Design an enzyme around this catalytic site. Structure first.
Site, PDB file in Angstrom:
ATOM      1  N   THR G   1       0.852  -1.224   0.000  1.00  9.22           N
ATOM      2  CA  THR G   1       0.000   0.000   0.000  1.00  9.22           C
ATOM      3  C   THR G   1       0.867   1.246   0.000  1.00  9.22           C
ATOM      4  OG1 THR G   1      -1.789  -1.087   1.250  1.00  9.22           O
ATOM      5  CG2 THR G   1      -1.771   1.344   1.215  1.00  9.22           C
ATOM      6  N   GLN G   2       0.550   2.177  -0.893  1.00  7.18           N
ATOM      7  CA  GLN G   2       1.263   3.440  -0.964  1.00  7.18           C
ATOM      8  C   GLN G   2       0.269   4.564  -1.196  1.00  7.18           C
ATOM      9  OE1 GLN G   2       0.757   1.462  -3.621  1.00  7.18           O
ATOM     10  NE2 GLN G   2       2.654   1.154  -4.794  1.00  7.18           N
TER      11      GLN G   2
END
Ligand SMILES: [Mg+2]
Ligand SMILES: [Mg+2]
Lengths: 231, 250, 240, 244, 222, 235, 233, 211
Positions: G1-2
Site C-alpha cells: 500500500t502506498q
C-alpha cells in the site's frame, strides 16, 4: 567404460555416455513418424502391446488445441515433458493471450533436457519426442532428442527401424510437402512412411495411432475404428 | 554447487585409528619447533621465525598471537590453519563470554572453545582436521598462570612446560632437567632461549626468534588512564632488542 | 543434508542392507510370544555373559507402549528405543485425536511403517530390530500377537519367536502348540513359553524373563522365583 | 561427484554389525582403564590416565572424571574431545529437566538421553560415531545409587561393578571374583585400586597416573556429596590401601 | 489506504427449465456514477455445455472464470477427455472460491447447464464457496428487485386458484424456453427502470442438448 | 559406487530392472477381467503353520469401485495404497464423482520414478489394479515400478507368472462369466503354487458395478475350490 | 500500500473506422504543484501499439521499462520478431493486466490507470482499459480520471455504439479528441495546455504527434463578468 | 437460522429451517442446512455456510479414509473430534461454524456440538442459530427419552416452526432427518407457511394469530 557412471562426466574423446545410453532407449522404442505440408502436420505412431491380453501403449499426447507430440522410449519421461509443454502453452495463453509458437516450445524442451545432462544426481530423459503444431507461421514439425537437440523438419521418424521410414520421407519430400488442404492424403503418406519400418507385424485397428493439426483443425488423436479408414 | 560433502572425512580404521588425526599430527611433527614454560610469576611461549625467503619481511608474519589481553598463543604445523584459528579464538572469546559476562574468559575455557572448534573439524562433514598443535599461555584471577597444549584431535592438556614440532622429543627432555616449581619469569625465558637454540640451525637472534610472555599487568600498554581497576594487558611480545639483550647473558 | 541411498536393490533383486539388518536380529537375544485363550505371554532370553548387572535399572526387554499393549524385540538395543519412543508418542497422539486407545493391529502397522520408511529413505539405514507386539484391543477379550521385521512386513501369529536360535524354539512351538486348543489358562501359557525357551537358553536362572498380559490393561512381569518354579516343575516331569 | 569419497559410516556388515561402532570399540580398548563399583552406601569411580609426563600439570588436569551435576558423574574411556561434546550436552539436559519439573533429573533419564544421541550417529547423518564409552555414577531418590555404561553403539546397561577401556576382560574377571552385594564404599575403593594395579600396562600404579572419585551419602544427613579426589588425596588412599 | 475491492455493478439471472437452462446478464459496467462500457460481456461459455457468470467485482470475476475455464481444460487432460458434469463443475468452483477464504473473490457466481439426466440445472455460489442447486436465481445489484417477481411468476407463490379462496394452490406447470425468455426480458426491463446500475443491453445464453446459443436485447441507456 | 538413477549401456535403469527381479520372487497374484466383473486372486504363502493366514492382506480395497492385488516386497505397497486411497477420495471431494480407474492407476504410477539422490529407491512391488467406471467399464491394470502401466484382459504377476500367463493366454476369451473367471484364477493358482491350494493359503476377490469391491470369505472360496475339483474330475 | 506522489491526469481515446486514437497531456503534477512540464505519458510499443498511462509517474516509468524489456525478450530466438511473431496490442495488454491484478493481490499496486490502444495483425482495432485494481473493460471510447467524466460524453456523441465506428473518419475522430483536450484544460485543475496525440491506423501505421497545444480558446466573455451577484463595477 | 438435534430411544432427530438472509433481504428460501457427511453421519449448519460445507465435506473424506484403513466405521466421538481439531488450526482466523454431528455407532446414538472455537460437547439435545431460544422452549417442555419416532419427528418439526414464526431470520421450510443404526433417513421438506396453518388448526396453538 570408466566415464559412464553418471551424466556429469565427459569421456576422453568428449562424449557423454549416459546421454548416449538414454538415446539408446529411444532406439528400443516403437516406431513413430512425423510429417507436414503447408496447411497440416501429421503424427503417425505404431503402438506396442505387452502381449495379446494387454492394451497397446498410447504414443501420442495433446499439449494444446494447436500443439501435441508423439513419444518413443520411456513413457513416464514423455508424460513429464508433455506436462511441462502443457503448462508452458498454458502460461502463454493466460498471461499474454498468445498461442505458444512451436519453435519456442522446442527451445523450452531443449533447455529443460539440458539441465539434466550437466548436473550431478539427475539423469537424462530417456525419451524422444516428435512435436507437431500449427501457429502464426503455419505448420511445424520438431524432433526432440534428450541430449537437448531439437530440430525443425519437414518429416522424420524415431524408434526401432525408423531408418526405413526416414529414407522414404527423404524420397517423398517434394510430394508430401505439396499436400495442402487435403488431410486424408497427408495421413496416407504418413501411414505409407511408417509401413517402411514394419517387419513380421502389420498395421491393425488397435495397433495404429494417428494425430493431426492444421489451419482449421484442432489437435485431434485418432485411435480404434477411426483409423480403420487408413489401414 | 552446494557443499555435498555432508559425510565425515575422518573415520575409524579397523585397528581403531583415526587416520586423518594421525596424519595431522605428522604434519605438526614436520613443523618448526615451538615451546612453552610456566614460571611462578608468569608464562613464556617461544618459537623460531623460519623465514621462507630473505626478501620476505618476517616481522609481518606473527607466529605468536594475542588472543585476549591476558592470553597468548603459538603453534607448530600449518601456519594458515593457525591464522584462521586465531581469528576464531579471538571472536569466540567475545561472543561466547565477554558479551555475556562483561569480562575476558579464563585460559582453560578459551582453550576449551578452541579445542571444540578443532574437534568439530575432526567429525563434521566435508572437512579435514586442523594441521596444528597449539600452545596457549594465559592468566586469570582465580586460576593464576597456566599453559595448555591443544592437538588436532581437540584434546588439550595443561603443562608446566612442553615443546611441540620438529625437535620436541629432545626439547622436552631438556625442559625436564631444567624445570622446577620455583622458577621466576626471567629464569623461564633463559631456559626457553637455551632449549630453542638446540633445534635452530642457522641464525639465532631477536630477528629470527619470536618470544612473548604472560606476566605482570602493563598499564603503559592500556592506552588510557582514569579507571583504577583497569591495569593493562598481561600479554606482552618481547622486542628484537629485548631478546638480544638476554642472548648476551646466555 | 546427507541424502545417500544406502538401501538399494542388487542385480539379483535383493536389498542387502535390509537383509543384513535381519542378521543383526539373528544375533540378538531370543524373544518368544505365545497367546493363550485369555492372555498373551512374552518370553525373553537374557544372555548370562553379563553378570554383575544391576537388574533393577537395566533396560527391560519388554516395554509398555500403552497400558494395554506391550512390545518386545530382538536385535540392536539402541535401535529398539527409537521405535518404542515413536510408538508411545503415536499411542498418545491417537488417544488425543480419536478418543480411543490404539488397537494392537494399528500400533503394529505404525511401527512396521516406520521400519519400512527407513528402507527407502535417503541417508538412513534400516532398523536392526524385529519386534513382537502383544496386547488386547479396548473392550475386547481376544488375545493379539503380531510380529514386525526390518523390511517393514508384519503379520499375526498364534505363537512366534525371534532372535538367535529362534529356528529351534519355533521348531518346538510348531509341534507343541495346538491351534484348536490353545493354553487355556495363564499357567499353561507361561509353562509352554518357559519350555520353549529352555530348548535354547542354557540355565533357567536369571536368563528367562516372562511378562503376562491379560485383558483390560492387566499387565504383570513374573519374578525370578515364580519363573524358577516353572523351570523346576518342567525338568522333574522330564526325568521320566 | 561427492559419493566417491563417502566411507558410509552408518552401514551393516554382512554379519549384521556396524563397522564404525566395532572399530570405535577397538579404539576404546586402547584407552586408559576406568572402573566403577557400586556399594550400599555409595559409588566409587577410578580411572587410569594414559602414559603421562612429569611436566603435566596434574592438579588442574581432567581427562577421565567429569561432573554432570551435583548428583551424577561420569568416567571417560576413548577420545577426550568427543567426550566433552557429549558431556556438555548432558549437563544442559540435566538443567532443562530441572527447569521444567523443578526436580533433579533421574540418573537413567540422563543416561538414556546421551545414549540416544550416540545411537543417532550410527543410524543417520553419515558422520563417524563418538569414540567414547562412559561409566555413569549417580544417585536419585527412586533407585538410589546407580552405575551405568554406554558405548558408541548407544546401548546402555546397569551394573553393580564394571570396567571400560583397556583390559576389561581381565578387570571384569577380578571384579566378579571379589565383589559382594553387602560391600561398602571403603571396601569398593580398595577393590577398584587393586583391580587397576593388576590390570595396568604400566610398571607400577602411582597417584600421578590416576583419577579418583566417590559419590557418598556420607554428606551430613539425607543428601549426596560428590568428591573428585585431589592428587594428594589419591596419594593418601594408595598408601592406606597398601599399594604404594 | 488501498482498497483492493471495487464494485462494477451488473445484474445476472439464471433459470432452469425442464430440458434447458438460461443464464442472462446486463452488459453495463460501471464505477460509482460513471459508465465504463455499455457492452462488456459478463456471461461466458466455459465449454462442456456449461455457462458461467461471476458478478460483482469485475477483476475477481474475470480471474475466477479464467481459472475455471482452465480447470475444465486440465480435467480433460487428466481424465481422458471426460465431459465435466455440471455438478462436478459446481464442486470444483467451491474449492476455487474457498482457496481465498481469507481474501475472497468478491463475486456472486452462477453457472447453468444440463445435469447427467438431461434436465436443466442452475447452481448458485456466494463469494466464499457455499453453493447449492436452484431452479431460479437472480444475482447482483438488482437481485432484490427481480427475485420476488420470479417467486411469483415462475414458482407461482401466493397465487391460488380462483373460486377456492386460498385452499388450492396454482399448480406448478413447466415453462417453455420462450416463456422463460419473456420473464427474463421483463425482469431486466423492470430492473432497468428502478436501478441506475442496470441498463444498456441484455445478453442471454441458452443451454440445451444441442449446445449453447446467444440472444441479445437492447435496454435503456440512461 | 554408482548413481541410483543410472542408465545401463542398453538404455535401461539398473534399479528399475533390479526391482523387477524382486517382484519375480514374490507370491503369485492373478487378475482376470470380464464383462460381468474383474476377479483378483492371490497366493498367500505363509512361511509357517503358526502364522494366522487371514492376517496376510495381499488384496486391498482402494475405493468402492476399485480393488488392488500385490506381488513382491509387499511392505512397499502400503504407501502406494495410502496414496491411491487418498487420490480416489480427494477426487470425489473436488469433483463429486468416482475417479476413473486409469486416472487412479496413473496417479499411483507417478510415484514410481520419484527416486534418486524423494525416496531412495524404486518400489519392489507390482500391483494389479482392478475396477469399474461408467466410461470404460470393467478394467484391469498392471502397475510396475518403472512407472509404466498396461491394461490387461488377464494378467499374472509373481514367481509363477510366465507359466500362468501362458495358461491365461489359452483360457481367456471375451465371453467369460464371473463364475468362470473365479474358477480359472483358482485353477492357475493351484497349478503354480508350491503347496496344495485351499481356502486358507489362497484368496479370491472381485469388483462388480452393483456390489463394488468384495474380498471373498474363506467359506465362499472353499465352495469354489470344491466346485473346481469336481469339474476337473468330470473329464 | 502506498500513495501516489507525482501524478499524470486524464488519458483519452476512441476508435474510428480504420484504427484508434489516443491522447494525454505532458504534465507531471506534485499535488497542486504543476511540477514537471515535459512528461511523455504515451508510450509506443513497436509500430502497432501505444500505451497511455495516468496516475503515479514512478510506476509509469517502471511499466515503461517492462514494455521495453518485453520487446527485447520477444526478439530472443525469434526470426519472425518483426513479422508474424511481433508483439500484438492484445499480448501487451494481457501482460499488463496480469501484472496489475497480481500487484493488487499482493496489496502493493501500481497506482495507475492504463489504456492500451493499437491495431491487431488482422486489422482489428484494439482499445482496452486496465487500472490499479486489475479491472478491465473495453468500449468505443475510453478515458481515465477526469476524462471519464468530461471527455467520454463528448466522444460518445461521435461514436455512441459499435455501429458508429465505420462511419467515423480519422479527421472527425482527431477533431473530437482535440476538442476534448481543450475542455479538460478549461475544467481540470491538474491539466496542461501541452499534450501528445497518437494515431494507430491499419493503413498508415503509427503517427505520433508531440508538442501539441490547446488552441482556439474562448476567454473574451470574462471581461463582462463582474462581482458575484450585486456588483455592477 | 434455526437448527436442532436431540437423542432419544430410537436414535437422533435432526431438524433445521431453510432461510438465508443478506441483511433484511431474504437471499434464499431454501438452503440445505444439513450436510450428508455419509450414510451414518449428519452435520447441521449454522454460521458461515461455506465453512460448514467445506470443513464437513472434508470431514467426510477423513471418515471414509478412516474406514478404508481400519476396515471399520468411525465413531461419532472420533468424527466430531477430527472436525474440532480442524477448527483449532484456524483458531482466531475468523471461521464461523456451529454444527451438531449426529450419528449411530457402537455406543448407541451419538450427538456432538462443535463450533469454530474448537468446543466439542456431548449431549442429549442441542439447538443453534438466531432462533434457538424459541426451539429450546418447545423441546425442553415436551422432550422425553421415551419418545416414539413419530412423536419425536413432530417435536423437532414443531420446535423449528416455533422459531420460524417468531425469529425474523428463520423460516422457509423444515427439513427432517432420523438417524438409525442402519443409517439416516430423510423425512422430507415441509413449507413453514403451509405447516403453520396446518399446526394452528390441528393443535389449536397460535391463537393470537388470525387465520
Ligand atoms: Mg437504469
Ligand atoms: Mg421468521
Amino acid at each position: 567404460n570408466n566415464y559412464d557412471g553418471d551424466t556429469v562426466t565427459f569421456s576422453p574423446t568428449g562424449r557423454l555416455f549416459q546421454v548416449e545410453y538414454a538415446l539408446e532407449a529411444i532406439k528400443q522404442g516403437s516406431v513413430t513418424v512425423g510429417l507436414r505440408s503447408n496447411t497440416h502436420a501429421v503424427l503417425v505412431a505404431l503402438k506396442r502391446n505387452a502381449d495379446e491380453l494387454s492394451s497397446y501403449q498410447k504414443k501420442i499426447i495433446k499439449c494444446d488445441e494447436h500443439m501435441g507430440l508423439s513419444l518413443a522410449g520411456l513413457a513416464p519421461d514423455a508424460r513429464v515433458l508433455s506436462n511441462y509443454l502443457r503448462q508452458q502453452c498454458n502460461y502463454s495463453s493466460l498471461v499474454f493471450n498468445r498461442k505458444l509458437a512451436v519453435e519456442r516450445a522446442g527451445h523450452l524442451l531443449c533447455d529443460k533436457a539440458q539441465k539434466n545432462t550437466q548436473s550431478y544426481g539427475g539423469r537424462p530423459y530417456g525419451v524422444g519426442l516428435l512435436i507437431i503444431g500449427y501457429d502464426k507461421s503455419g505448420a511445424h514439425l520438431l524432433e526432440f532428442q534428450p541430449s537437448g537437440n531439437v530440430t525443425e523438419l519437414y518429416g522424420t521418424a524415431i524408434g526401432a527401424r525408423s531408418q526405413g521410414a526416414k529414407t522414404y520421407l527423404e524420397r517423398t519430400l517434394d510430394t508430401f510437402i505439396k499436400i495442402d488442404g487435403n488431410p486424408d492424403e497427408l495421413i496416407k503418406a504418413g501411414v505409407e512412411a511408417i509401413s517402411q519400418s514394419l517387419r513380421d507385424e502389420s498395421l491393425t485397428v488397435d495397433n495404429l495411432s494417428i494425430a493431426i493439426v492444421g489451419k482449421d483443425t484442432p489437435f485431434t488423436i485418432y485411435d480404434g475404428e477411426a483409423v480403420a479408414k487408413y489401414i | 554447487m552446494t557443499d555435498r560433502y555432508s559425510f565425515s572425512l575422518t573415520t575409524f580404521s579397523p585397528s581403531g585409528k583415526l587416520g586423518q588425526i594421525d596424519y595431522a599430527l605428522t604434519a605438526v611433527k614436520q613443523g618448526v619447533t615451538s615451546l612453552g614454560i610456566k614460571a611462578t610469576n608468569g608464562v613464556v611461549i617461544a618459537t623460531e621465525k623460519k623465514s621462507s625467503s630473505p626478501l620476505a619481511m618476517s616481522e609481518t608474519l606473527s607466529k605468536v598471537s594475542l588472543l585476549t589481553p591476558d592470553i597468548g598463543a603459538v603453534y607448530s604445523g600449518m601456519g594458515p590453519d593457525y591464522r584462521v584459528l586465531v581469528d576464531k579464538s579471538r571472536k569466540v572469546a567475545h561472543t561466547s563470554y565477554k558479551r555475556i559476562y562483561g569480562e575476558y574468559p579464563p585460559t582453560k575455557l578459551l582453550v576449551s572453545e578452541v579445542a571444540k572448534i578443532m574437534q568439530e573439524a575432526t567429525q563434521s562433514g566435508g572437512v579435514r582436521p586442523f594441521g596444528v598443535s597449539l600452545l596457549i599461555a594465559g592468566h586469570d584471577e582465580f586460576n593464576g598462570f597456566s599453559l595448555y597444549q591443544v592437538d588436532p584431535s581437540g584434546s588439550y592438556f595443561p603443562w608446566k612446560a612442553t615443546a611441540i614440532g620438529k625437535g620436541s622429543v629432545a626439547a622436552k627432555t631438556f625442559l625436564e632437567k631444567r624445570w622446577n616449581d620455583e622458577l621466576e619469569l626471567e629464569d623461564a625465558i633463559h631456559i626457553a632461549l637455551l632449549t630453542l637454540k638446540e633445534s635452530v640451525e642457522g641464525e639465532f637472534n631477536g630477528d629470527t626468534i619470536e618470544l612473548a610472555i604472560i606476566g605482570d599487568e602493563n598499564p603503559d600498554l592500556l592506552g588510557y588512564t582514569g579507571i583504577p581497576t583497569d591495569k593493562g594487558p598481561r600479554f606482552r611480545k618481547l622486542t628484537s632488542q629485548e631478546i638480544n639483550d638476554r642472548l648476551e647473558a646466555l | 543434508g546427507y541424502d545417500r541411498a544406502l538401501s538399494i536393490f542388487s542385480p539379483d533383486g535383493h536389498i542387502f542392507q535390509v537383509e543384513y539388518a535381519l542378521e543383526a536380529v539373528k544375533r540378538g537375544t531370543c524373544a518368544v510370544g505365545v497367546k493363550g485363550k485369555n492372555c498373551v505371554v512374552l518370553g525373553c532370553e537374557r544372555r548370562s555373559t553379563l553378570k554383575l548387572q544391576d537388574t533393577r535399572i537395566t533396560p527391560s526387554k519388554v516395554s509398555k507402549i500403552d497400558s494395554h499393549v506391550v512390545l518386545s524385540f530382538s536385535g540392536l538395543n539402541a535401535d529398539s528405543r527409537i521405535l518404542i519412543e515413536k510408538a508411545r508418542v503415536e499411542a498418545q497422539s491417537h488417544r488425543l485425536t480419536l478418543e480411543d486407545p490404539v488397537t494392537v493391529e494399528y500400533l503394529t502397522r505404525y511401527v512396521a511403517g516406520v521400519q519400512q520408511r527407513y528402507t527407502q529413505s535417503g541417508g538412513v539405514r534400516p532398523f536392526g530390530v524385529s519386534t513382537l507386539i502383544a496386547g488386547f484391543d479396548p473392550r475386547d477379550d481376544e488375545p493379539k500377537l503380531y510380529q514386525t521385521e526390518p523390511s517393514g512386513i508384519y503379520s499375526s501369529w498364534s505363537a512366534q519367536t525371534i532372535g538367535r536360535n529362534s529356528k529351534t524354539v519355533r521348531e518346538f512351538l510348531e509341534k507343541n502348540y495346538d491351534r484348536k486348543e490353545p493354553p487355556a489358562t495363564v499357567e499353561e501359557c507361561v509353562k509352554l513359553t518357559v519350555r520353549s525357551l529352555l530348548e535354547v537358553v542354557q540355565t533357567g536362572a536369571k536368563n528367562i524373563e516372562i511378562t503376562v498380559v491379560k485383558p483390560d490393561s492387566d499387565i504383570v512381569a513374573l519374578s525370578s522365583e515364580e519363573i524358577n518354579q516353572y523351570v523346576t516343575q518342567i525338568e522333574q516331569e522330564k526325568q521320566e | 561427484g561427492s559419493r566417491r569419497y563417502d566411507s558410509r559410516t552408518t552401514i551393516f556388515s554382512p554379519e549384521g554389525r556396524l563397522y564404525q561402532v566395532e572399530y570405535a570399540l577397538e579404539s576404546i580398548s586402547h584407552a586408559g582403564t576406568a572402573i566403577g563399583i557400586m556399594a550400599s552406601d555409595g559409588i566409587v569411580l577410578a580411572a587410569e590416565r594414559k602414559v603421562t609426563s612429569t611436566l603435566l600439570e596434574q592438579d588442574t588436569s581432567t581427562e577421565k572424571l567429569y561432573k554432570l551435576n551435583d548428583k551424577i558423574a561420569v568416567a571417560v574411556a576413548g577420545l577426550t574431545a568427543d567426550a566433552e561434546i557429549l558431556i556438555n550436552t548432558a549437563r544442559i539436559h540435566a538443567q532443562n529437566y530441572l527447569k521444567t519439573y523443578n526436580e533433579d533429573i533421574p540418573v537413567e533419564i540422563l543416561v538414556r538421553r546421551l545414549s540416544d544421541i550416540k545411537q543417532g550417529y550410527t543410524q543417520h547423518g553419515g558422520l563417524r560415531p563418538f569414540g567414547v564409552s562412559f561409566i555413569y555414577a549417580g544417585y536419585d531418590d527412586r533407585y538410589g545409587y546407580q552405575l551405568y555404561t554406554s558405548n558408541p553403539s548407544g546401548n546402555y546397561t546397569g551394573w553393580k561393578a564394571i570396567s571400560v577401556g583397556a583390559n576389561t576382560s581381565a578387570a571384569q574377571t577380578l571384579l566378579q571374583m571379589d565383589y559382594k552385594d553387602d560391600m561398602k564404599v571403603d571396601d569398593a575403593i580398595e577393590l577398584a585400586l587393586k583391580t587397576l594395579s593388576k590390570t595396568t600396562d604400566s610398571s607400577a600404579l602411582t597417584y600421578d597416573r590416576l583419577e579418583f572419585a566417590t559419590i557418598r551419602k556420607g554428606a551430613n544427613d539425607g543428601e549426596v556429596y560428590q568428591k573428585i579426589f585431589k592428587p594428594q588425596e589419591i596419594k593418601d588412599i594408595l598408601v592406606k590401601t597398601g599399594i604404594t | 489506504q488501498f482498497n483492493p475491492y471495487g464494485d462494477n455493478g451488473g445484474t445476472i439471472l439464471g433459470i432452469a427449465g425442464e430440458d434447458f437452462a438460461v443464464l442472462a446478464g446486463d452488459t453495463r459496467n460501471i464505477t460509482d456514477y460513471s459508465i465504463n462500457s455499455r457492452y462488456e460481456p459478463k456471461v461466458f461459455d466455459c465449454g462442456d455445455n456449461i455457462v458461467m457468470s461471476a458478478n460483482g467485482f469485475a477483476a475477481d470475476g474475470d480471474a475466477l472464470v479464467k481459472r475455471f475455464k482452465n480447470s475444465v481444460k486440465w480435467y480433460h487432460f487428466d481424465h481422458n477427455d471426460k465431459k465435466l458434469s455440471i455438478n462436478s463443475a459446481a464442486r470444483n468452483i467451491q474449492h476455487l472460491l474457498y482457496s481465498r477464504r481469507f481474501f475472497p473473490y468478491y463475486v456472486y457466481n452462477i453457472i447453468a447447464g444440463l445435469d447427467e439426466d438431461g434436465k436443466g440445472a442452475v447452481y448458485s455460489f456466494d463469494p466464499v464457496g457455499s453453493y447449492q442447486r436452484e431452479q431460479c436465481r437472480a444475482g447482483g445489484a438488482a437481485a432484490s428487485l427481480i427475485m420476488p417477481f420470479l417467486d411469483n411468476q415462475v414458482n407461482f407463490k401466493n397465487q391460488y386458484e380462483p373460486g377456492t379462496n386460498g385452499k388450492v394452490k396454482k399448480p406448478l406447470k413447466y415453462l417453455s424456453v420462450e416463456e422463460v425468455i419473456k420473464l427474463v426480458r421483463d425482469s431486466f426491463t423492470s430492473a432497468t427502470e428502478r436501478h441506475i446500475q442496470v441498463g444498456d443491453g441484455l445478453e442471454i445464453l441458452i443451454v440445451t442438448k444441442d449446445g449453447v446459443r446467444k440472444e441479445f436485447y437492447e435496454l435503456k441507456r440512461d | 559406487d554408482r548413481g541410483v538413477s543410472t542408465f545401463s549401456p542398453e538404455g535401461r535403469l539398473f534399479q528399475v530392472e533390479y526391482s523387477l527381479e524382486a517382484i519375480k520372487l514374490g507370491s503369485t497374484a492373478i487378475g482376470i477381467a470380464t464383462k460381468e466383473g474383474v476377479v483378483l486372486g492371490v497366493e498367500k504363502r505363509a512361511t509357517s503353520p503358526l502364522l494366522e493366514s487371514d492376517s496376510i492382506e495381499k488384496i486391498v480395497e482402494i475405493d468402492r469401485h476399485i480393488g488392488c492385488a500385490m506381488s513382491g516386497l509387499t511392505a512397499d505397497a502400503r504407501s502406494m495404497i495410502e496414496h491411491a486411497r487418498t487420490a480416489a477420495v480427494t477426487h470425489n471431494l473436488y469433483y463429486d464423482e468416482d475417479i476413473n480407474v486409469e486416472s487412479l492407476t496413473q496417479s499411483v504410477c507417478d510415484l514410481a520414478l520419484r527416486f534418486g539422490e524423494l525416496m531412495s529407491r524404486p518400489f519392489g512391488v507390482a500391483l494389479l489394479i482392478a475396477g469399474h467406471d461408467a466410461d470404460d467399464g470393467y478394467q484391469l491394470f498392471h502397475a510396475e515400478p518403472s512407472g509404466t502401466f498396461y491394461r490387461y484382459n488377464a494378467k499374472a504377476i509373481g514367481s509363477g507368472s510366465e507359466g500362468a500367463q501362458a495358461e491365461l493366454l489359452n483360457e481367456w476369451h471375451s465371453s467369460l462369466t464371473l463364475k468362470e473367471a473365479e474358477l480359472l484364477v483358482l485353477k492357475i493358482l493351484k497349478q503354480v503354487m508350491e503347496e496344495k491350494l485351499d481356502e486358507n493359503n489362497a484368496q479370491l476377490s472381485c469388483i462388480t458395478k452393483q456390489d463394488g469391491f468384495k474380498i471373498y470369505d474363506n467359506e465362499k472360496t472353499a465352495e469354489l475350490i470344491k466346485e473346481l475339483k469336481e469339474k476337473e474330475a468330470a473329464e | 500500500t502506498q500513495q501516489p506522489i507525482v501524478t499524470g491526469t486524464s488519458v483519452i481515446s476512441m476508435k474510428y473506422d480504420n484504427g484508434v486514437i489516443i491522447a494525454a497531456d505532458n504534465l507531471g503534477s506534485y499535488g497542486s504543484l504543476l511540477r514537471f512540464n515535459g512528461v511523455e505519458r504515451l508510450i509506443p510499443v513497436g509500430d502497432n501499439t501505444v500505451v497511455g498511462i495516468s496516475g503515479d509517474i514512478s510506476d509509469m516509468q517502471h511499466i515503461e521499462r517492462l514494455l521495453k524489456d518485453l520487446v527485447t525478450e520477444n526478439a530472443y530466438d525469434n526470426p519472425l520478431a518483426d513479422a508474424e511473431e511481433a508483439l500484438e496490442p492484445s499480448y501487451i495488454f494481457e501482460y499488463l493486466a496480469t501484472v496489475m491484478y497480481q500487484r493488487r493481490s499482493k496489496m502493493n499496486p501500481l497506482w495507475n490507470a492504463i489504456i492500451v490502444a493499437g491495431v491487431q495483425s488482422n486489422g482489428d482495432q484494439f482499445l482496452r482499459y486496465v487500472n490499479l485494481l486489475g479491472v478491465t473493460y473495453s468500449s468505443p471510447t475510453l478515458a481515465t480520471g477526469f476524462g471519464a467524466h468530461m471527455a467520454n460524453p463528448l466522444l460518445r456523441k461521435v461514436v455512441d455504439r459499435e455501429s458508429d465506428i465505420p462511419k467515423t473518419t480519422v479527421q472527425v475522430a482527431e477533431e473530437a479528441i482535440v476538442n476534448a483536450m481543450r475542455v479538460l484544460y478549461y475544467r481540470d485543475a491538474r491539466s496542461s495546455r501541452n499534450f501528445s496525440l497518437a494515431i494507430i491506423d491499419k493503413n498508415t501505421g503509427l503517427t505520433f504527434k508531440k508538442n501539441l497545444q490547446v488552441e482556439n480558446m474562448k476567454w473574451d466573455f470574462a471581461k463582462d463578468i463582474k462581482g458575484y451577484g450585486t456588483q455592477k463595477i | 437460522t434455526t437448527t436442532l438435534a436431540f437423542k432419544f430411544q430410537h436414535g437422533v432427530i435432526a431438524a433445521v429451517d431453510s432461510r438465508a438472509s443478506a441483511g433484511s433481504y431474504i437471499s434464499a428460501l431454501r438452503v440445505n442446512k444439513v450436510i450428508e457427511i455419509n450414510p451414518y453421519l449428519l452435520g447441521t449448519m449454522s454460521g458461515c455456510a461455506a465453512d460448514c460445507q467445506y470443513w464437513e465435506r472434508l470431514l467426510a473424506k477423513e471418515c471414509r479414509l478412516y474406514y478404508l484403513r481400519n476396515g471399520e466405521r468411525i465413531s461419532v466421538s472420533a468424527a466430531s473430534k477430527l472436525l474440532s481439531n480442524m477448527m483449532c488450526q484456524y483458531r482466531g482466523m475468523g471461521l464461523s461454524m456451529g454444527s451438531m454431528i449426529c450419528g449411530w455407532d457402537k455406543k448407541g446414538p451419538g450427538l456432538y456440538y462443535v463450533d469454530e472455537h474448537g468446543t466439542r460437547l456431548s449431549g442429549n439435545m442441542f439447538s443453534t442459530g438466531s432462533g434457538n431460544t424459541y426451539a429450546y422452549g418447545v423441546l425442553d417442555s415436551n422432550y422425553k427419552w421415551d419418545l416414539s419416532v413419530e412423536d419425536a419427528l413432530y417435536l423437532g418439526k414443531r420446535s423449528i416452526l416455533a422459531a420460524a414464526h417468531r425469529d425474523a431470520y428463520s423460516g422457509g421450510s423444515v427439513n427432517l432427518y432420523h438417524v438409525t443404526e442402519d443409517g439416516w433417513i430423510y423425512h422430507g421438506n415441509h413449507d413453514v407457511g403451509e405447516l403453520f396453518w396446518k399446526v394452528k388448526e390441528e393443535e389449536g396453538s397460535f391463537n393470537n394469530v388470525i387465520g
